[PDB]
């Protein structure tokens, strides 16, 4: 069940690419013009361009150039977090990029939430940070997550994250915050300089 004799030797160990026979017979006139038309259809170049001499995959430079020139969704970012999503995609989602984000970047992204849409975007970015990049969390990531959820009004997301934080990867959950979020305590943190017990709806008692 070896294709080394069915196809040219240069295209061995090729998986995922569909119809390698197209690249085997690409030297024909009609196949060559079809390939040229397809590359022009994908665009990104001015001259009539074709695939290299013997390659069943697109060149890395051409693929990266087309990826960068690709029109991106969300043209108009309203909030600073909306702009931060664009710049994060620019830096840590470039084609063939070896860079990996940091929990400092995650905290900066999460601290810019103002709208519930901003909260949804930040939560999705956190989830992809922990699933795709698999980045270990810091001590205060859950603190900033709780602050964001409280100041955006999402109690249920905080409770859902608390109930099974271990699948979420939150290796540090404070006893004060767990008691507050499990319906046993009315406050979760105190301001050092202000000496008041957050949230404000609880501060209305102590004052």
């Amino acid at each position: 069940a070896s294709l080394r004799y069915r196809r040219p030797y240069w295209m061995m160990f090729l998986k995922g690419v569909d119809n390698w026979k197209i690249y085997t017979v690409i030297q024909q006139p009609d196949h060559q013009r079809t390939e040229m038309l397809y590359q022009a259809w994908l665009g990104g170049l001015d001259r009539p361009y074709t695939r290299p001499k013997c390659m069943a995959n697109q060149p890395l430079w051409l693929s990266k150039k087309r990826h960068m020139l690709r029109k991106e969704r969300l043209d108009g970012p309203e909030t600073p977090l909306e702009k931060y999503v664009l710049e994060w995609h620019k830096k840590f989602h470039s084609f063939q990029g070896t860079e990996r984000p940091t929990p400092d970047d995650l905290h900066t992204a999460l601290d810019l939430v103002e709208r519930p849409l901003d909260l949804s975007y930040a939560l999705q970015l956190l989830g992809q940070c922990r699933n795709l990049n698999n980045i270990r969390f810091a001590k205060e990531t859950f603190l900033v997550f709780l602050e964001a959820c409280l100041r955006v009004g999402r109690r249920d997301c905080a409770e859902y994250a608390l109930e099974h934080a271990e699948p979420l990867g939150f290796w540090f959950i404070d006893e004060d915050h767990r008691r507050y979020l499990q319906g046993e305590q009315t406050w979760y943190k105190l301001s050092p300089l202000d000496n008041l017990y957050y949230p404000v709806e609880e501060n209305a008692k102590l004052n």
């Binding site: 240069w10 030297q27 001499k53 060149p59």
Partner: protein, 213 residues
Amino acid sequence: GHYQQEAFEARKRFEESTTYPGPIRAATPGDTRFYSGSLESILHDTDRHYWRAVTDDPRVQHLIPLRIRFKIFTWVTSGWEQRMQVVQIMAPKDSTIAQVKDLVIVENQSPYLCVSSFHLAIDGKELDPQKTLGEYGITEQSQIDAIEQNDHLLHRDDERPRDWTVDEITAEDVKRSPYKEMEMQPLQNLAPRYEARPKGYFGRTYYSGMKQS
């Protein structure tokens, strides 16, 4: 190992011997050019195509086949691979390094090897172009390589030749010397056919002299 030292000792004592009228030229024949098989195979100066059961008198070698190893970046379909080429020159017994360089640049017969000035080195030590092989004690088994002007920075991608697989080749670049020989445009006959090997030919890692698994 043992052959070189015993041959040197035998030659030394043969030179030291004084009671010898000399070998008979008629009795000692030379190598023949005609023999069976459709291949012209050259052997050592002490070997003959015919069966010679007697060991002839040792002789001083007046023509050493110096073999110089050049780097060569052949174009494989997967990518550029750096390999080794050997250029063999026939230099006299007392040829200086200057004439050795002349011989190697006249017998390289490769467009890429002699592109720029280079210096001959042995085991990493450069050779002085003023003294001859007598000072260095160079024999036919000596391993000599060459270092070019820009081989000390070949690790840089800019110095490395740019393959069309990962790098973009411009309209000005297709008019350059190597990239004109290479053809990025797949012709119907595919005139520039090169050696091809799969990306997974050596596995997940490249070729190495050690084990990484």
